Amino acid sequence: CYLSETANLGKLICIPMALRAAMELNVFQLISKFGTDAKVSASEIASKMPNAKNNPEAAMYLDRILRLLGASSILSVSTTAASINRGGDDVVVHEKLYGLTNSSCCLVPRQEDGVSLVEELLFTSDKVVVDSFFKLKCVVEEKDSVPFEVAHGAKIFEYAATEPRMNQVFNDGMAVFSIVVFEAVFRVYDGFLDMKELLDVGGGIGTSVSKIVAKYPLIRGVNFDLPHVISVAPQYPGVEHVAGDMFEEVPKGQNMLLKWVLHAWGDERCVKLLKNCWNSLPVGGKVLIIEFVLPNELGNNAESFNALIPDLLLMALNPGGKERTISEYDDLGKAAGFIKTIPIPISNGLHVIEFHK
Amino acid sequence: VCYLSETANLGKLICIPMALRAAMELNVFQLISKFGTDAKVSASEIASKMPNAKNNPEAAMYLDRILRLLGASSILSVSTEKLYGLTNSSCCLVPRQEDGVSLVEELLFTSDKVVVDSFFKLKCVVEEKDSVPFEVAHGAKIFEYAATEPRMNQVFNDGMAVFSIVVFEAVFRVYDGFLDMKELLDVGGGIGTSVSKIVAKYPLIRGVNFDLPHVISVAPQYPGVEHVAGDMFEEVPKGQNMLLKWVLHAWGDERCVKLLKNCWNSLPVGGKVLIIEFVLPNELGNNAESFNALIPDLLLMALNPGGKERTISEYDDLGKAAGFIKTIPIPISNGLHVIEFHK
Ligand SMILES: Nc1ncnc2c1ncn2[C@@H]1O[C@H](CSCC[C@H](N)C(=O)O)[C@@H](O)[C@H]1O
Ligand SMILES: Nc1ncnc2c1ncn2[C@@H]1O[C@H](CSCC[C@H](N)C(=O)O)[C@@H](O)[C@H]1O
Ligand SMILES: COc1cc2c(cc1O)[C@@H]1Cc3ccc(OC)c(O)c3CN1CC2
Ligand SMILES: COc1cc2c(cc1O)[C@@H]1Cc3ccc(OC)c(O)c3CN1CC2
């Protein structure tokens, strides 16, 4: 009935915004620091927040966020015999205990290097992205509209050159997610072993090629991106930075990488970029495409959602952006002069697709 | 645990509500329903009924990319261009053929930019004593903002009013307590839709709708309803019986007791005030009664100082502090209650 569906439909905006607040308050890392199978109250978690130390009501407000995440199965919820038993019939215990789940373990920065899914999820729920989603209907109603352009007056990469906060949130979301994806690549794919040089075309701040050279130290690494990205990139061992425009000229390189680049652009733009890569490669060279591939038949699984999530984001964020099937990627490479397409499944829809010159 | 499994579970959370808002603004669910409520239809068939899309060759392919995410999330059925059909959830997004009622107006209010911009400041309520996320985002409190922002005033007022109609249809199936009333004052009654529906069912009730000037001045004329403007914290008009629906949950304990004492002073011996709210259950889980309370609990935490959902015991404590001497809680549906306070 209506008053069943109010719950199913009304929770949809609330859950992601409660999740974002919990990430910004460092809830998941604070729970982790109590140990392996920890179950801790809102007051114990708030005790570890110096910013809350003069707010008597902090824990009761925090509990209101955490109990929604518990109902949604993002946190586990429990109590103790002492809480049920010690106060007597006239005392009410309002505070339950919260623990991590398989999903919230992926929101804890790792002890060794700080990696997790936090930075990418803070980008996809950033106000710059949500404001673009508020204009999503314009793609259906208006020929050649782009929601990001309706919201902001500029396209995304040009906007990043003028807005240093957005530039940082985007660049860090790509870089930390990159580390997670390359750990999965290196478990399955052996095509880097024989290389002597790798050029990362649209390589962001250089994190991806930094990880490739760390694993394969005989590779000379080159990172190529727009001026406003290269100006903020760190110095990485074994990585040379190059600034420019991939649609005008790609540097010469023995092999090339395009990760999370083709999915932002329409077919003509993709073929133009791939022809620029072909001209700058030697005979025998290859370019590697790394993307979440759209399955031939969609269903209820991680591989399907891993493509549908960025398909909706790129529809909002850039003209022509979309996720593609194996056959659609093959068609782009073939149109640009490449041969011997080799699609390599990695994990949950993530592929390496090799294009040979 | 695998990072590249959990990317799917966590990354869809922001995407689903924003796809749902676009589909409601494009009237997708009503367009499917006009082929027949059991119909299965393609993105191109749906787009052919949107005059705004008629010079956009690419409209159906973009529409399909929105609808296939909703089909993967149980809001639409998908079958083999794929064909889309309604579900139990999306039938509640079709304006009724009889009167245009659905959940659309309330769902467009709780995902409105004014509300989402408040949720961007939600962490401030934990860190900073006495902060309110809406105030941090907008520079004024919500009812003051509505007085200077006509678009927001309309979205809020219409969300409350259309939701009110489906709530009172549930109330009238279970609760008989309006019979033999001769007069009812709706305190904080919005644009008056609630008291209009009570007088339609109980034609001997003289209905009075009471709210702030910026709400009353935009309210429609309803048969059997008189509108009065004022400030409920300063004084409430005399009335034989009163209603407080979705009012107490916006305010802290001291403000609630002040308002309830104003109501007590303006009631006769033998009068009652009715509280209508979604009541917080004693145990929370993955079920409609739990989420019906947790959704507005999170919204009012963001939107107004002191606002929160309450248990039956906590409502009783407020009525007793204001002088009321008999509390009768009446379950209606999925956590919604009528709670009578007797003078
Ligand atoms: N014309 C252009 N020339 C070079 N880089 C460009 C470009 N237009 C966009 N880009 C870059 O394309 C990248 C897309 S995001 C992906 C970054 C990285 N390859 C990763 O997988 O993490 C951004 O860093 C962006 O600045
Ligand atoms: N000081 C005050 N005096 C009277 N109305 C007030 C008020 N402060 C807030 N309100 C009103 O309280 C209402 C809360 S929203 C609920 C409206 C209606 N009772 C329903 O259930 O649909 C709004 O219409 C708002 O304008
Ligand atoms: C499965 O969940 C996700 C998967 C992916 C992304 C975000 C998710 O949450 C991001 C989103 C995104 C947005 C804009 C981009 O360029 C403008 C961009 O390259 C990417 C990369 N993709 C990689 C795939
Ligand atoms: C179960 O889903 C929902 C339940 C409820 C609301 C919205 C939902 O989506 C709205 C949200 C809301 C926000 C602000 C208010 O005053 C400032 C207000 O009275 C209400 C009313 N409540 C009624 C209960």
Tab-separated table of N, CA, C and O in Angstrom, chain B residues 170-207:
chain	number	residue	atom	x	y	z
B	170	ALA	N	-6.011	6.216	5.106
B	170	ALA	CA	-5.647	5.138	6.063
B	170	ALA	C	-6.311	5.385	7.421
B	170	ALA	O	-6.847	4.441	8.050
B	171	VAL	N	-6.263	6.635	7.934
B	171	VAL	CA	-6.893	6.981	9.239
B	171	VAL	C	-8.381	6.596	9.230
B	171	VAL	O	-8.840	5.959	10.195
B	172	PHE	N	-9.132	6.996	8.211
B	172	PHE	CA	-10.606	6.782	8.202
B	172	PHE	C	-10.984	5.292	8.151
B	172	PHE	O	-12.118	4.968	8.520
B	173	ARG	N	-10.087	4.412	7.673
B	173	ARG	CA	-10.359	2.936	7.639
B	173	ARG	C	-10.362	2.366	9.063
B	173	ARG	O	-10.968	1.255	9.240
B	174	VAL	N	-9.739	3.021	10.049
B	174	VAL	CA	-9.502	2.423	11.404
B	174	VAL	C	-10.116	3.269	12.538
B	174	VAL	O	-10.540	2.713	13.556
B	175	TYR	N	-10.117	4.591	12.410
B	175	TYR	CA	-10.393	5.539	13.526
B	175	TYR	C	-11.739	6.232	13.271
B	175	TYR	O	-11.867	6.846	12.186
B	176	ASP	N	-12.567	6.238	14.323
B	176	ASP	CA	-13.973	6.728	14.302
B	176	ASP	C	-14.124	8.009	15.141
B	176	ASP	O	-15.275	8.509	15.239
B	177	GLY	N	-13.034	8.557	15.706
B	177	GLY	CA	-13.130	9.583	16.774
B	177	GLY	C	-13.593	10.965	16.311
B	177	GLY	O	-13.866	11.816	17.177
B	178	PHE	N	-13.657	11.219	15.002
B	178	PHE	CA	-14.231	12.473	14.483
B	178	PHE	C	-15.774	12.489	14.531
B	178	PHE	O	-16.381	13.600	14.473
B	179	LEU	N	-16.424	11.340	14.675
B	179	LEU	CA	-17.921	11.323	14.693
B	179	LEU	C	-18.432	12.157	15.889
B	179	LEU	O	-17.807	12.170	16.935
B	180	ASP	N	-19.504	12.897	15.702
B	180	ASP	CA	-20.078	13.764	16.816
B	180	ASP	C	-19.193	14.964	17.223
B	180	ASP	O	-19.664	15.728	18.048
B	181	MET	N	-18.002	15.193	16.639
B	181	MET	CA	-17.379	16.525	16.770
B	181	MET	C	-18.239	17.537	16.004
B	181	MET	O	-18.799	17.180	14.932
B	182	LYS	N	-18.311	18.785	16.464
B	182	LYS	CA	-19.000	19.864	15.732
B	182	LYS	C	-18.017	20.920	15.222
B	182	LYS	O	-18.447	21.753	14.401
B	183	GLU	N	-16.777	20.938	15.731
B	183	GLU	CA	-15.774	21.950	15.331
B	183	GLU	C	-14.398	21.354	15.533
B	183	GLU	O	-14.148	20.640	16.525
B	184	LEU	N	-13.484	21.617	14.591
B	184	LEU	CA	-12.086	21.117	14.641
B	184	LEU	C	-11.143	22.208	14.115
B	184	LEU	O	-11.367	22.708	12.994
B	185	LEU	N	-10.145	22.547	14.920
B	185	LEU	CA	-9.064	23.508	14.596
B	185	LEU	C	-7.786	22.731	14.318
B	185	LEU	O	-7.277	22.013	15.168
B	186	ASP	N	-7.278	22.875	13.072
B	186	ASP	CA	-6.008	22.200	12.651
B	186	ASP	C	-4.842	23.185	12.875
B	186	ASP	O	-4.728	24.178	12.135
B	187	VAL	N	-4.055	22.941	13.932
B	187	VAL	CA	-2.995	23.857	14.389
B	187	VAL	C	-1.715	23.516	13.575
B	187	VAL	O	-1.186	22.394	13.657
B	188	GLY	N	-1.197	24.494	12.816
B	188	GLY	CA	-0.133	24.185	11.861
B	188	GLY	C	-0.626	23.297	10.702
B	188	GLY	O	0.102	22.408	10.250
B	189	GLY	N	-1.854	23.534	10.246
B	189	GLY	CA	-2.567	22.714	9.228
B	189	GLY	C	-2.103	22.863	7.796
B	189	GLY	O	-2.695	22.219	6.889
B	190	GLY	N	-1.066	23.652	7.529
B	190	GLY	CA	-0.589	23.807	6.144
B	190	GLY	C	-1.579	24.600	5.304
B	190	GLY	O	-2.193	25.581	5.811
B	191	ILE	N	-1.766	24.185	4.043
B	191	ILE	CA	-2.730	24.863	3.138
B	191	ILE	C	-4.201	24.365	3.326
B	191	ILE	O	-5.068	24.832	2.596
B	192	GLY	N	-4.469	23.515	4.341
B	192	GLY	CA	-5.859	23.191	4.739
B	192	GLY	C	-6.429	21.926	4.140
B	192	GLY	O	-7.621	21.614	4.370
B	193	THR	N	-5.620	21.156	3.395
B	193	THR	CA	-6.095	19.956	2.697
B	193	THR	C	-6.577	18.929	3.744
B	193	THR	O	-7.626	18.262	3.525
B	194	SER	N	-5.846	18.752	4.847
B	194	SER	CA	-6.245	17.772	5.895
B	194	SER	C	-7.658	18.073	6.426
B	194	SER	O	-8.545	17.168	6.440
B	195	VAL	N	-7.924	19.318	6.858
B	195	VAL	CA	-9.238	19.635	7.440
B	195	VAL	C	-10.306	19.575	6.332
B	195	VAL	O	-11.463	19.192	6.619
B	196	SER	N	-9.959	19.887	5.075
B	196	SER	CA	-10.922	19.748	3.949
B	196	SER	C	-11.391	18.295	3.814
B	196	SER	O	-12.615	18.057	3.568
B	197	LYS	N	-10.496	17.334	3.989
B	197	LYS	CA	-10.837	15.882	3.849
B	197	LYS	C	-11.647	15.408	5.075
B	197	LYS	O	-12.589	14.580	4.923
B	198	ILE	N	-11.356	15.898	6.263
B	198	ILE	CA	-12.142	15.586	7.471
B	198	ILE	C	-13.584	16.100	7.316
B	198	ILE	O	-14.539	15.327	7.600
B	199	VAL	N	-13.771	17.346	6.891
B	199	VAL	CA	-15.142	17.910	6.707
B	199	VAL	C	-15.882	17.164	5.582
B	199	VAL	O	-17.110	16.992	5.672
B	200	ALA	N	-15.166	16.717	4.522
B	200	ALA	CA	-15.834	15.933	3.457
B	200	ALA	C	-16.425	14.618	4.020
B	200	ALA	O	-17.509	14.210	3.580
B	201	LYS	N	-15.712	13.959	4.946
B	201	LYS	CA	-16.163	12.676	5.560
B	201	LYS	C	-17.201	12.924	6.679
B	201	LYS	O	-18.049	12.048	6.890
B	202	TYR	N	-17.123	14.060	7.382
B	202	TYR	CA	-17.914	14.391	8.591
B	202	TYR	C	-18.540	15.775	8.379
B	202	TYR	O	-17.997	16.809	8.823
B	203	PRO	N	-19.685	15.821	7.644
B	203	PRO	CA	-20.174	17.087	7.100
B	203	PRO	C	-20.747	18.083	8.124
B	203	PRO	O	-21.046	19.225	7.729
B	204	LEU	N	-20.887	17.665	9.380
B	204	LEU	CA	-21.363	18.566	10.449
B	204	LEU	C	-20.195	19.283	11.153
B	204	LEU	O	-20.451	20.125	12.017
B	205	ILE	N	-18.949	18.934	10.810
B	205	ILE	CA	-17.777	19.624	11.433
B	205	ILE	C	-17.561	20.991	10.765
B	205	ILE	O	-17.404	21.037	9.502
B	206	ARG	N	-17.526	22.039	11.582
B	206	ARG	CA	-17.031	23.369	11.145
B	206	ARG	C	-15.494	23.377	11.244
B	206	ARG	O	-14.941	23.215	12.336
B	207	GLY	N	-14.800	23.352	10.102
B	207	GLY	CA	-13.338	23.215	10.067
B	207	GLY	C	-12.638	24.572	10.029
B	207	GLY	O	-13.039	25.473	9.261
